[PDB]
Amino acid sequence: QAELPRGCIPRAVEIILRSELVETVQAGDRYDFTGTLIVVPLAGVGTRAENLNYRMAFLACSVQATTARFGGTDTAEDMKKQMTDAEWHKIYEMSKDRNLYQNLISSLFPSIYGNDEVKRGILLQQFGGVAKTTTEKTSLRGDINVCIVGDPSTAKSQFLKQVSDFSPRAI
Amino acid sequence: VVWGTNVVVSQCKSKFKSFIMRFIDPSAEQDEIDVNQPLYLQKLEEIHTLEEPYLNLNCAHLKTFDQDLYRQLICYPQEVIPGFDMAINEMFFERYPAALLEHQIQVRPFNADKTRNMRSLNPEDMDQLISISGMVIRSSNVIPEMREAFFSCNICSFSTTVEVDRGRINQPTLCTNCNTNHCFRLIHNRSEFTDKQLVKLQESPDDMAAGQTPHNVLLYAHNDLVDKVQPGDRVTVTGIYRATPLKTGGLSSSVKSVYKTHVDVVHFRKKDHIFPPERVELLQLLAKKPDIYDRLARAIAPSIYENDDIKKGILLQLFGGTKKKHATLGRQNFRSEIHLLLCGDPGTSKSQMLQYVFNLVPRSQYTSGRGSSAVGLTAYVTKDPETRQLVLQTGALVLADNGVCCIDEFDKMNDSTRSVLHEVMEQQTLSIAKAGIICQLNARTSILAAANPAESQWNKRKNIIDNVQLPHTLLSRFDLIFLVLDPQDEIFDKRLASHLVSLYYVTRHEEEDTMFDMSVLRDYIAYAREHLSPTLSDEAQQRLIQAYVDMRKVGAGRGQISAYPRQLESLIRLSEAHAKVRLSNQVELLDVEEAWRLHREALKQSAT
Ligand SMILES: Nc1ncnc2c1ncn2[C@@H]1O[C@H](COP(=O)(O)OP(=O)(O)O)[C@@H](O)[C@H]1O
Numbered sequence: 001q002a003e004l005p006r007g008c009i010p011r012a013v014e015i016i017l018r019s020e021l022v023e024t025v026q027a028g029d030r031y032d033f034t035g036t037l038i039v040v041p042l043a044g045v046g047t048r049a050e051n052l053n054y055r056m057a058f059l060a061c062s063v064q065a066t067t068a069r070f071g072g073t074d075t076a077e078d079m080k081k082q083m084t085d086a087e088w089h090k091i092y093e094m095s096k097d098r099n100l101y102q103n104l105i106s107s108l109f110p111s112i113y114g115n116d117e118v119k120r121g122i123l124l125q126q127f128g129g130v131a132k133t134t135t136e137k138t139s140l141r142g143d144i145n146v147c148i149v150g151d152p153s154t155a156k157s158q159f160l161k162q163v164s165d166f167s168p169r170a171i
Numbered sequence: 172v173v174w175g176t177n178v179v180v181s182q183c184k185s186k187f188k189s190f191i192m193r194f195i196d197p198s199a200e201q202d203e204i205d206v207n208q209p210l211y212l213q214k215l216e217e218i219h220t221l222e223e224p225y226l227n228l229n230c231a232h233l234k235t236f237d238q239d240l241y242r243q244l245i246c247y248p249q250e251v252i253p254g255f256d257m258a259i260n261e262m263f264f265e266r267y268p269a270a271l272l273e274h275q276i277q278v279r280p281f282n283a284d285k286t287r288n289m290r291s292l293n294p295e296d297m298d299q300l301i302s303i304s305g306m307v308i309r310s311s312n313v314i315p316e317m318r319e320a321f322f323s324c325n326i327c328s329f330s331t332t333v334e335v336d337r338g339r340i341n342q343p344t345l346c347t348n349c350n351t352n353h354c355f356r357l358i359h360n361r362s363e364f365t366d367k368q369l370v371k372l373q374e375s376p377d378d379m380a381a382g383q384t385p386h387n388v389l390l391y392a393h394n395d396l397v398d399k400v401q402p403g404d405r406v407t408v409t410g411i412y413r414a415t416p417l418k419t420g421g422l423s424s425s426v427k428s429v430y431k432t433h434v435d436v437v438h439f440r441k442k443d444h445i446f447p448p449e450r451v452e453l454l455q456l457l458a459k460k461p462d463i464y465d466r467l468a469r470a471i472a473p474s475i476y477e478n479d480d481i482k483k484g485i486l487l488q489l490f491g492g493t494k495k496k497h498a499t500l501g502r503q504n505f506r507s508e509i510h511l512l513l514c515g516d517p518g519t520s521k522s523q524m525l526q527y528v529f530n531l532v533p534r535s536q537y538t539s540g541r542g543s544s545a546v547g548l549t550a551y552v553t554k555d556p557e558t559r560q561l562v563l564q565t566g567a568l569v570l571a572d573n574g575v576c577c578i579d580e581f582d583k584m585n586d587s588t589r590s591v592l593h594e595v596m597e598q599q600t601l602s603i604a605k606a607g608i609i610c611q612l613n614a615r616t617s618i619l620a621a622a623n624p625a626e627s628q629w630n631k632r633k634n635i636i637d638n639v640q641l642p643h644t645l646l647s648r649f650d651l652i653f654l655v656l657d658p659q660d661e662i663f664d665k666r667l668a669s670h671l672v673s674l675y676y677v678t679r680h681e682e683e684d685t686m687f688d689m690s691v692l693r694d695y696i697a698y699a700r701e702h703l704s705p706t707l708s709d710e711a712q713q714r715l716i717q718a719y720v721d722m723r724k725v726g727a728g729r730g731q732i733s734a735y736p737r738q739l740e741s742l743i744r745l746s747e748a749h750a751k752v753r754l755s756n757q758v759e760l761l762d763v764e765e766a767w768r769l770h771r772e773a774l775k776q777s778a779t
Pocket residue numbers: 111112113114152153154155156157158597736737
């Protein structure tokens with residue numbers, strides 16, 4: 001799809017991966033491979049010899065399975081883990097400010113103006129639940145619904161068309 | 172003389188050399204250029220001033236000499252040609268001694284005559300010369316083919332090779348044998364391979380047997396002629412009947428009386444648009460006049476001189492929109508998303524006009540309402556005998572990224588489809604997930620379509636608000652549907668019934684005041700996607716920003732549709748579009764006026 005000509009079909013290639021290359025590819029991904037085309041050990045009615053009709057094949061031994069990569073959370077400083085919150089230098093401030101609520105509210109919708117009531121709520125959805133330690137009574141739940149209704153196109157959809165691009169795993 | 176021949180290489184060599192020297196471009200300088208020189212030393216200049224090899228001939232040159240060589244090249248072409256190659260390599264040294272005299276050239280003759288056509292052939296023309304044609308069918312993958320192998324050993328590294336004659340190879344007890352240290356060791360990789368490939372061909376001139384399928388033929392390939400051509404073309408062939416037996420059984424080695432026939436490959440008969448600055452003269456010369464807004468609007472059609480009020484908006488899609496690129500912050504993907512549609516009676520030439528527009532737009536697609544479903548437009552997933560395995564596979568829309576697809580007879584499509592287009596028109600994306608792949612491709616383009624109602628005529632006292640088969644506010648959700656209908660007037664009929672039949676009756680055109688440029692008009696379309704970036708200073712904002720009170724008193728209405736605060740998105744789109752024409756890098760202020768005209772031309776068709 002980075003090379004989109006007209007006319008012919010999507011010509012298919014055979015292609016191979018080695019062991020440590022295995023199972024870190026996946027459906028739906030664009031790649032940067034090696035080019036180590038090979039001699040591959042009816043209808044080919046050419047001349048025959050001996051002192052045989054081959055097809056084409058291919059292998060490759062390098063992968064950059066990009067456009068499908070985020071990496072979770074790991075100021076180069078000390079913390080619980082390596083880089084999970086190494087920005088203590090500022091997160092200390094981001095947990096002690098008194099106007100942080102509003103400063104957070106207006107930190108994702110500068111290109112938007114409307115009500116200022118779901119700009120303080122909808123962090124709800126991305127925010128945590130409970131994750132507590134209990135017995136085998138039942139599932140205990142952490143996140144919860146939200147709803148929107150509105151008149152025709154007060155930017156009902158641009159709230160969420162972007163939110164998918166905002167956090168990961170949530171298409 | 173060679174065994175089954177009656178000729179000699181040297182006589183043909185000498186006579187072809189003298190023929191090329193006795194040459195003044197005589198095939199069209201004597202028979203039919205300010206060149207009283209051989210075209211062939213001229214062509215070796217052209218080959219060497221380029222060092223771009225691969226000559227070709229035409230056998231009509233060789234009428235001027237003896238007709239004998241034509242005959243004794245028709246009869247034995249597979250044996251005579253390379254003498255002409257060494258004649259070429261003599262002419263190499265005659266042109267320049269220290270040249271690139273190691274890269275060899277083909278020879279690509281053609282044109283004895285059409286036999287009659289491919290249906291009517293005989294046995295006796297079995298190793299001779301033919302040239303027929305038709306249409307191309309397929310485009311298949313290429314195949315190596317051995318001519319020599321690599322070998323080995325363990326003591327002293329007998330690292331050897333030996334090649335093919337055609338079908339007979341040798342081996343002593345060793346490779347590079349001395350004293351017999353071991354037996355023969357075969358590998359088959361570190362070797363030389365040659366390209367070839369099979370491509371099927373039709374007969375479709377009018378050289379057809381009535382009520383008969385075309386009897387089809389087949390062609391091999393060789394190295395620098397492999398996928399020489401893309402499919403879907405009419406191409407002539409130059410080659411030789413080249414036969415081979417068939418293998419009876421396969422379980423046994425007996426062979427069938429039916430020798431097959433097929434033709435070898437000799438020759439066929441068929442960033443990349445960056446212009447010179449000389450064309451900029453004529454381009455900007457067209458640009459310099461306000462008449463350009465009307466000239467191209469007049470000059471799309473051949474002669475259709477009614478409702479030119481609309482094509483002046485279609486040029487805003489031909490001039491395919493603006494690019495407010497989003498390399499800035501990653502936000503909101505507000506493309507210059509343009510969509511405009513036409514809808515009316517079937518008598519108006521919508522299907523006809525748009526089949527012509529197929530013969531205008533580069534990325535022309537043309538299916539239509541009940542032409543193919545949603546799945547009929549996306550994910551043609553199915554089995555293929557080529558891999559012989561199941562595959563996640565193609566769509567239709569996504570082939571036309573940034574292009575157009577002319578669409579007809581819209582209101583026949585299934586409800587599964589037409590919630591697909593909601594995804595593209597309102598997100599301009601696509602993401603797909605089946606039991607196989609999950610996909611996040613890229614696709615975006617501008618729509619055209621030519622819907623029709625469930626009747627012959629739009630009913631008066633029944634607005635489009637309910638007539639055609641769509642929701643209460645998604646009807647108007649397109650930019651603006653430029654209403655069309657038959658001219659309800661007998662008066663107009665005579666003008667076209669006269670002018671557009673005299674059109675046929677004379678059978679050629681005339682360059683009147685609206686000067687049709689043969690192709691120089693087409694670059695003003697071509698060049699004007701790339702070097703432009705419309706921008707706003709102060710112009711196309713302030714008028715409705717002023718009049719918004721009475722423009723947005725739209726609260727009144729019983730079951731109506733009207734103005735909403737999305738219009739100005741489409742309006743800035745149309746604005747910077749019409750500012751692109753005239754090539755105004757900064758925004759145009761006049762564009763706003765005809766934009767308002769465009770809108771209020773059809774936004775109170777329901778005052779009721
Ligand atoms: N307060 C606001 N801030 C930003 N944009 C707004 C605001 N109010 C209205 N809009 C505009 O309203 C439009 C709503 O379109 P949208 O609701 O996404 O269409 P649809 O209803 O088809 O999804 C947005 O494109 C936006 O430009």
